């Protein structure tokens, strides 16, 4: 809420697609991702360790999340109540392949 | 010996009180402890482990250096690496960024 009223945010995101992805997601994941997120667009000025002490007041003044730090943040935060549909989507890694009518007229069925 | 970074770039400085029974409890403006600095030290050389004694408003305090970044005349930004080397000096500019850190006794407010 408070992000978008603050300007802090890109004008990228749609939250739709993100309710789209959460397949299994309960109330309380939601904000590790929003966590998560801030804390790959903050790390990206810092750069804690090597190369140190380029705070400034330029970087801090334009910050905003992008898309795809949300979809880094998936990375790192996992269901819980989803964990065996992940055998399922694992069940095919060998692929689909149609070398035959059959397989279309049982996959209709 | 410098070559070309013969300025200081941006200072760090750790400010403690002297005397511990002087401890007071004012909200110091770091603006105006920068130009205290600058007007009672300018264009004077500096090294990290350096130490000064510094009145300000009748207040007597310790500064050490902690460390210093030198940069050249015609340095858009500031690449160059802060370096904890005391070998490393510099001479002060009325433009440094210059960041003070509470001391190890941790009082100065």
């Known amino acids: 809420k408070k992000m978008r009223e603050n300007n802090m945010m890109s004008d990228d995101v749609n939250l739709a697609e993100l309710a789209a992805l959460t397949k299994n997601f309960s109330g309380a994941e939601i904000e590790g991702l929003v966590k998560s997120a801030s804390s790959f667009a903050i790390n990206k000025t810092v750069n804690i360790g090597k190369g140190a002490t380029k705070l400034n007041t330029k970087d801090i003044a334009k910050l905003k999340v992008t898309r795809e730090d949300f979809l880094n943040a998936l990375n790192d935060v996992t269901p819980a109540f989803g964990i065996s549909e992940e055998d399922l989507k694992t069940c095919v890694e060998g692929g689909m392949m149609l070398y035959s009518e059959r397989v279309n007229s049982i996959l209709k069925n | ?109």
Not at chain 2, 13 to 33: N, P, Y
Not at chain 2, 40 to 47: A, K
């Open chain 2, 1 to 109: 010996y410098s070559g070309k970074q013969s300025y200081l770039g941006s200072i760090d400085i750790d400010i403690s009180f002297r005397a511990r029974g002087k401890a007071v409890s004012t909200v110091f403006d770091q603006d105006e402890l920068a130009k205290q600095f600058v007007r009672c030290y300018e264009s004077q050389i500096f090294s990290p482990t350096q130490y000064l004694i510094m009145e300000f408003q009748g207040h007597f305090f310790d500064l050490k250096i902690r460390n210093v970044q030198a940069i050249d005349l015609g340095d858009i930004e500031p690449t160059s690496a802060v370096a904890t080397g005391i070998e490393t000096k510099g001479i002060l500019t009325k433009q440094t960024q210059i960041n003070f850190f509470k001391g190890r006794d941790g009082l100065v407010n």
